């Protein structure tokens, strides 16, 4: 019904949408999985205090 | 870090505990920065275990 946005019970990585189709003697699921596949180090600050 | 989701971070573990504690219990930064032995209290429990 909705994007899981939580622990990956469904497709590995963040799951945008999941589509379910009947399988012989069962149900087959076809989730969509997002994988970054690249990581670049960026120095970051915790906003600012004024 | 509570703000970071599924992302790498470079913060001390004690700061990470504070972010999780702030989400778990609504304690203001002034309240959290009082005795400053809150992490030490966790260490005492870990030592007892």
């Amino acid at each position: 019904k909705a994007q899981s946005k939580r622990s990956g019970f469904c497709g590995q990585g963040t799951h945008i949408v999941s589509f379910v189709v009947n399988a012989p003697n069962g149900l087959y699921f076809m989730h969509v999985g997002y994988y970054p596949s690249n990581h670049i180090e960026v120095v970051s600050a915790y906003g600012l205090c004024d | 870090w509570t703000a970071g989701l599924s992302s790498f971070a470079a913060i001390p573990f004690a700061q990470s505990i504070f972010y999780r504690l702030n989400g778990v219990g609504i304690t203001q930064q002034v309240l959290s920065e009082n005795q400053k032995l809150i992490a030490n209290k966790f260490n005492q429990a870990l030592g007892a275990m």
């Binding site: 939580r6 622990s7 990956g8 019970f9 | -």
Partner: protein, 49 residues
């Protein structure tokens, strides 16, 4: 005597194989329980840790 001994061997073989069948069945049940517990463990690590 050998002829009587062969008859004794037969029943002993039948008893041993049935006991092995029960042992294998218990191991199969344990493996199915392990698969369920491993799935629970993976969910627990992602949800809590």
């Amino acid at each position: 005597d050998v002829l009587e001994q062969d008859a004794q061997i037969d029943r002993l073989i039948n008893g041993r194989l049935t006991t092995l069948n029960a042992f294998v069945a218990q191991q199969l049940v344990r493996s199915e329980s392990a698969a369920l517990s491993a799935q629970l463990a993976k969910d627990k690590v992602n949800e809590c840790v």
